[PDB]
Amino acid sequence: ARKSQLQRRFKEFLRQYRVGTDRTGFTFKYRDELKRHYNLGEYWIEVEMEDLASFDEDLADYLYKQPAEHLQLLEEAAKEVADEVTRPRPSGEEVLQDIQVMLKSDASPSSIRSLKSDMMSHLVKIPGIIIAASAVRAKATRISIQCRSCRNTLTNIAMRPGLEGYALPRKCPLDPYFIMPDKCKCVDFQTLKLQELPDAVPHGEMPRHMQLYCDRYLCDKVVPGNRVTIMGIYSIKSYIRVLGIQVDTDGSVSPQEEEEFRRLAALPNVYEVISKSIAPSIFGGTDMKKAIACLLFGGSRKRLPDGLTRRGDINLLMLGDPGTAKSQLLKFVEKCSPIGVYTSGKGSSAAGLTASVMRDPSSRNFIMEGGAMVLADGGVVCIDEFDKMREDDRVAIHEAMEQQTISIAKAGITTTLNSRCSVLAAANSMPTILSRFDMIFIVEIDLAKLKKFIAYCRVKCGPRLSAEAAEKLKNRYIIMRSGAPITVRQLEAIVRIAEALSKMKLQPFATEADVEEALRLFQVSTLDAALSGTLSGVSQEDQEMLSRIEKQLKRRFASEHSIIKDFTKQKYPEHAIHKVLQLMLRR
Amino acid sequence: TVVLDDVELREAQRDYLDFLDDEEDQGIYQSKVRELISDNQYRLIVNVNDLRRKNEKRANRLLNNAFEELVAFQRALKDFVASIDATYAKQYEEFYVGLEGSFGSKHVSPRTLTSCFLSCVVCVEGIVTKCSLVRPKVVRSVHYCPATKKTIERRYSDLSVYPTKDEENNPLETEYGLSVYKDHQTITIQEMPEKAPAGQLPRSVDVILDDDLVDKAKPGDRVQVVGTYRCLPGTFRTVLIACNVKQMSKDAQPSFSAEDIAKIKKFSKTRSKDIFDQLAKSLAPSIHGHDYVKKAILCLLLGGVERDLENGSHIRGDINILLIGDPSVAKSQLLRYVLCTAPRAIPTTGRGSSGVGLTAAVTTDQETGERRLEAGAMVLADRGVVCIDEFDKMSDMDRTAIHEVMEQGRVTIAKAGIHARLNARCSVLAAANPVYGRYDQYKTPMENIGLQDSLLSRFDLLFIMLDQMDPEQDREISDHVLRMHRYRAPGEQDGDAMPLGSAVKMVSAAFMKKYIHVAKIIKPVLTQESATYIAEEYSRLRSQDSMSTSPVTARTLETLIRLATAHAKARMSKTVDLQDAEEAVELVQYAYFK
Ligand SMILES: Nc1ncnc2c1ncn2[C@@H]1O[C@H](COP(=O)(O)OP(=O)(O)O)[C@@H](O)[C@H]1O
Ligand SMILES: [Mg+2]
Ligand SMILES: [Zn+2]
């Protein structure tokens, strides 16, 4: 029950601990790790709470109950063991550097919702997905002040780690004191925002947000959008003192659930069952339900031989009417999706659909916040009024749907945020984006069971095209080109739809019948596209009429409202007139 | 309450004076200081390694403790200069010391410049992104009181402050001549874009320059600054006080490993005739056809050899390529492959980097209301490659700006009362889809997109790639696409797709990047036989111009020379060969004659 005794316990645990066996030797894992790190420029370690508990359960109990103080003792013990292990440091290097001890545990995560104040100042471990990150700044831990009048100095004033303020003395001239930065010691500092995982969000509830504080090497290890698990000290200034970060670099179901899913796949009408079973509560849907099902299951995120990756997601656009029940349909689908984010083109969020870097005045510092796209990475993004995106959002969405990544730029350096989100957009009437939408349409199983099946299939089965199916698609594509329009990007969209259809049945490969169904959906989309060329036409006839506008304007000249009205009365679309005017301005 | 004397400071000063007192030895530093006096400069460059050799402990003290040790070193240098020459020492109030040489661990980059280095000498290498206007800064102000007939002085240094009245409120008038002002500038440094992972956030370090160090840096310059990293007065904004700034060659060299060099040599010596063909085939395997386009992209990557003449001309060794073609073609995919393969390439769109656009710009900080000359994408692409998408959508101001960089390779900005002429030598690979799609082979490429035909003149190669609906070509493309999509990794069980990750004959892309980076260093030269052959081929091209793309002219001749040099680089040959000229000629024929 003495601090020195506890520090001795930590020192012996770090240096004397043994891992392996007689065959593999009783290696001092922590001793070797400390030696390797100090020989390098790491000056940190990873502590396995399981290892500590195995060595001395009382130490783990102390860390859980009182994390800050025992953590300081453990850090000092790490310093001592590193010093003794690396006592003969070369010239100049003989100055001993502090060691940041980072700790990990095998214990199951804890829901962010289940965080009582009683655990404040008690070690916690919670999962989440980061939504915003802060520029790495410098925060002082050891400071010294001087009395402007008396010249009295108070050196090495320890500042408790965390998002706390300062403590200026009342006097020895009264309170005024001068900080002397020369001897001040500071460490890196970084504030992050962690959000509850979309899986665990309550129905119709906004996920809660927490502030995380990472200072030493543990900072700058994560970027907004990452799925992480954090061990730290629950603190209240309300925030978390981070002590260990695990990033889900890869990946992230009861046997009865698997058996039920296998049964569902085995159903011959599984395609029809899913199509009909999604939204029985809504009326006026024919093969749009099938399209939404294909979007939910999504295609296969392939990795080409050269190492590049081709978006496995399928983007669906619904063009048409405000009166239709696509708001209800979007709400239902985002509810059903294992990861679903629903917003509008005018969501009004500071980040917006994509990420955004903004200087917060509260600290006057750059904060990078993740938009809806990045948050729904690996899920679905429902976008009402997709035609009403912001200028920056309009610029970003091109790459967002192209490379499935959001790229922000600082001078030369560029940060990339993974957004592998299938987009379900709704609009009434920029046009370049329409080219990148895989499918465009003009106007039983429980929801939870559907979501579970979707997640299971998505994480387990990724289909591929069979030789017969691929050859059938190739011949069909040649026929469509000969008749014509169809583009290679549309061929890739058809391939993704076919892969999604095969995945619905949990088949390793895609049958030619699956290609036929995918082609049926794409032919629905393409005859709809013919009548959309009638709707939009943004096209040999359009080019000819644009040339007619060019000739007419050349003849006229070589108010603005009157000119626009006349050309519109000449059957010329307003968009065509504006495009011609802009082109002639560029010339 | 005044320090009568200090033993440590005296010892340090005397030791530094002894070190500079290089007369009983090689005399390197005594000669250095003599040359410094003769040159009128007042900043001695000192190799830290020499100090370590003479005294390891003293060098360790200097590195760990920077401010005090540097003050002592400056004192010793001034004393030594006075001893050698008193009048010259009197000319300058203080003489600064600039460090140099290898730093064990203090040599870091802005990404790795952790806060643990505070108060320690650091050697930060990076790319200058923002620069501030040179402004005078008062370091010592002298005031005069006529009422008391008394002259007072004040020092600001690192420390309403400007004194204006005597303690009795008698007016004080400044003595501008006597007071001491030094020119002062602020810049920003970031890690080299090539070696800066996208996962991490940007890491920018501010740098303060004074005296002769002021203008020895510009945006878009890869520079190494050795200085003292200090905390500004109070969260604590951190800045690096520069002791010396040196611009390192942007070309640099491919350090890599001896094994990589041996592999490159073996690959080059295996089949030099077909090496270019194999690299072109393996450039973008996901894309079918477009063989000549891939060859041109490879030539751009290798790039020509810049020629600088006695008259100050700077005939550019870069190669610029433009790609026009119907949508749903691999243009964007080709640009992505170039980004993934080019040794040092930067992506951008028609809009360019936000605010700064493509070329440099002048921006008011709006945090302190201060002007800053911020480098754009083109400037940061210097001696590299810039991959422009949607080149048609470039703004009119950018349309005018791109002209100067394309012509001369340097961007000049005088707006906002800020003068700058930043190097922007960078090969540009631009892709622009034709307006209203469905390219028509009736109008000129200018009239198809709108460039004024002057940019078309600037671009060396302009490739028109149309989506011809040939059943045979379509079958080939579809077969290639489906074969790529069906492809499965060597180890897999036809199961799951690649798990979602939180981290962002045929030669490996990394190997190709390394090989082209190594080849770029070579400096091939023309051969008389090659010169005659290229002259004959150029005459033939002019002759073929009789029939009525852009006309063949001297621009085409320089393009052919650059392509021949690039293909010579591909084979590593120190001299161009008839094969290189023939390949360049056939490529140009394809570009201008389908
Ligand atoms: N020759 C080709 N071989 C393989 N894929 C192609 C080819 N031409 C086009 N593509 C397809 O086009 C898509 C990329 O189109 P993109 O370059 O973005 O169009 P654009 O550059 O005209 O906007 C890729 O998915 C690619 O598979
Ligand atoms: Mg493109
Ligand atoms: Zn006092």
CA-CA distance, B207 to B123, in Å (whole number)? 12
CA B331 – ligand 2 centroid, Å: 6
Q: Is A399 in the pocket of ligand 1 (CB under 6 A)?
A: no
Residues of A in contact with B450 (CB under 8 A): 583, 586-587
Helix axes B528-544, B554-570, angle to 10 degrees: 140
SS3 content of chain A, % helix, strand, coil (to 5): 40, 25, 35
Q: Is B252 in the pocket of ligand 1 (CB under 6 A)?
A: no
Residues near B367 by beta carbon (within 8 Å), at least 6 away in sequence: A359, A364
Give the residue numbers of the binding site of A for ADP: 310
Which atom of ligand 1 is found nearest the CA of A402?
Answer: 18
Residues of B in contact with A435 (CB under 8 A): 327-328
B377 is in an annotated binding site: yes
Q: Is B108 helix (H, G, I), strand (E, B) or coil?
A: strand
Q: How many angstroms from the chain centroid is the CA of residue A15?
A: 39
Shortest CA distance to B54 belongs to which of B96, B84, B20, B8? B20
CA-CA distance, B170 to B462, in Å (whole number)? 76
Write the burial class of residue B557 (CB in 10 Å: 0-12 exposed, 13-18 middle, 19+ buried): middle
Shortest CA distance to B440 belongs to which of B475, B472, B407, B467? B467
What are the Cα distances from residue B352, in Å, to B180, B231, B366, B375, B395?
43, 34, 21, 12, 9
Residues near A4 by beta carbon (within 8 Å), at least 6 away in sequence: none
Instruction: Give contacts of A 322-351 with B, CB under 8 A.
Output: none
What tokens appear for B544 in the block?
């073929």
Q: What is the DSSP letter of B418?
A: -
CA-CA distance, A552 to B176, in Å (whole number)? 71
Q: Is A235 helix (H, G, I), strand (E, B) or coil?
A: strand
A555, containing H or E segment? helix A540-556
| Elucidated via | cryo-EM
CA-CA distance, B381 to B359, in Å (whole number)? 10
- B86 to chain A nearest CA, in Å? 34
Write the burial class of residue B193 (CB in 10 Å: 0-12 exposed, 13-18 middle, 19+ buried): buried
Residues of B in contact with A310 (CB under 8 A): 485
Shortest CA distance to A295 belongs to which of A387, A198, A423, A455? A423
What is the distance in angstroms between the CA of the first residue and the CA of the last residue of chain A?
Answer: 84
Residue nearest to atom 1 of ligand 1 (CA): B288
Q: Is the Cβ–Cβ distance between A76 and B88 less than 8 Å?
A: no
B63 is in an annotated binding site: no
Residues near B138 by beta carbon (within 8 Å), at least 6 away in sequence: B156, B179, B180, B181
Residues near B430 by beta carbon (within 8 Å), at least 6 away in sequence: B320, B321, B322, B323, B387, B388, B391, B459
What tokens appear for B325 in the block?
């073609």
Q: Is A525 helix (H, G, I), strand (E, B) or coil?
A: helix
CA-CA distance, B356 to B129, in Å (whole number)? 11
Amino acid, res. B488: R
CA-CA distance, A131 to A355, in Å (whole number)? 9
CA-CA distance, B104 to B108, in Å (whole number)? 10
What are the Cα distances from residue A398, in Å, to A433, B101, B441, B455?
7, 47, 28, 26
Write the burial class of residue A397 (CB in 10 Å: 0-12 exposed, 13-18 middle, 19+ buried): buried
Q: Is the Cβ–Cβ distance between B126 and B222 less than 8 Å?
A: yes
Shortest CA distance to B424 belongs to which of B387, B381, B374? B381
Shortest CA distance to B348 belongs to which of B310, B390, B306? B390
Q: Is the Cβ–Cβ distance between A73 and A10 less than 8 Å?
A: yes
Shortest CA distance to B36 belongs to which of B53, B20, B52, B51? B20
Partnered with residue A157 across adjacent β-strands are: A143
SS3 content of chain B, % helix, strand, coil (to 5): 40, 20, 40
CA-CA distance, B316 to B350, in Å (whole number)? 23
- The residue segments making up the domain with residue A478 are 256-533
Search chain A and give the residue with CA nearest B478. A474
What are the Cα distances from residue A78, in Å, to A9, A96, A159?
11, 12, 21
Q: Is A158 in the pocket of ligand 1 (CB under 6 A)?
A: no
Q: Is the Cβ–Cβ distance between A115 and A124 less than 8 Å?
A: yes
Q: How many angstroms from the chain centroid is the CA of residue A254?
A: 27
Partnered with residue A423 across adjacent β-strands are: A381
Instruction: Give contacts of A 29-48 with B, CB under 8 A.
Output: 41, 43
Shortest CA distance to A348 belongs to which of A399, A317, A385, A379? A385
What tokens appear for A194 in the block?
């962690």
- Cβ within 8 Å, pair A411-B235: no
Phi, psi (deg, nearest 5) at residue B230: -125, 160
Whose structure tokens read 């290639």?
A: B480
Whose structure tokens read 């001795």?
A: A8
Q: Kindly report the CATH number assigned to the domain that includes residue A528.
A: 3.40.50.300
Instruction: Kindly state whether A89 is in contact with chain B, defined as any CB-CB distance less than 8 angstroms.
Output: no
Q: Which of B324, B329, B331, B349 to mutate to test the pocket of ligand 1 (most atoms within 8 A of CB)?
A: B329
Q: In units of Å, what resolution does this entry have?
A: 3.5
Half-sphere exposure of B16 (CA within 13 A, CB side): 28
Q: How many angstroms from the chain centroid is the CA of residue A54?
A: 36
Partnered with residue A25 across adjacent β-strands are: A21
CA-CA distance, A180 to B53, in Å (whole number)? 34
Residues near B414 by beta carbon (within 8 Å), at least 6 away in sequence: B420
- Cβ within 8 Å, pair A97-B116: yes
Instruction: Kindly state whether A544 is in contact with chain B, defined as any CB-CB distance less than 8 angstroms.
Output: no
Q: Is the Cβ–Cβ distance between B81 and B87 less than 8 Å?
A: no
Rg (C-alpha) for chain B, rounded Å, is 30
Q: Is the Cβ–Cβ distance between A152 and A209 less than 8 Å?
A: no
What are the Cα distances from residue A508, in Å, to A304, A492, A500, B490, B493?
18, 19, 11, 16, 9
Strands (E) in B82-193, as ranges, are: 96-100, 107-108, 121-131, 135-145, 150-155, 173-174, 180-190
What tokens appear for A558 in the block?
């070589």
Instruction: Kindly state whether B496 is in contact with chain A, defined as any CB-CB distance less than 8 angstroms.
Output: yes
Residues near B270 by beta carbon (within 8 Å), at least 6 away in sequence: none
Which is it for strands A413-418 and A316-319: parallel, antiparallel or unpaired? unpaired
CA-CA distance, A221 to B111, in Å (whole number)? 12
Strands (E) in B399-533, as ranges, are: 410-413, 420-423, 427-432, 461-465
Q: Is the Cβ–Cβ distance between B145 and B172 less than 8 Å?
A: yes
Write out A295-340 in H/E/C secondary structure: HHHCCCCEECCCCCEECCCCCEEEECCCCCCHHHHHHHHHHHCCCE
CA-CA distance, B362 to B418, in Å (whole number)? 8
Q: Is the Cβ–Cβ distance between A368 and A356 less than 8 Å?
A: yes
Number of CB atoms found within 10 A of residue A108's CB: 7
Q: Is the Cβ–Cβ distance between B133 and B80 less than 8 Å?
A: no
CA-CA distance, A495 to A299, in Å (whole number)? 8
Helix axes B509-521, B258-270, angle to 10 degrees: 90
CA-CA distance, B194 to B347, in Å (whole number)? 11
Residue nearest to atom 9 of ligand 1 (CA): B329
Write out B59-85 in H/E/C secondary structure: HHHHHHCCHHHHHHHHHHHHHHHHHHC
CA-CA distance, B200 to B269, in Å (whole number)? 40
- Cβ within 8 Å, pair A187-B284: no
CA B334 – ligand 2 centroid, Å: 10
Search chain B and give the residue with CA nearest A41. B105
B448 sits in the region (left: phi over 0; alpha: psi -120 to 50; else beta) called alpha
Q: After which residues is chain B broken (C to N over 2.5 A)?
A: 159, 234, 504, 548
CA-CA distance, B377 to B351, in Å (whole number)? 11
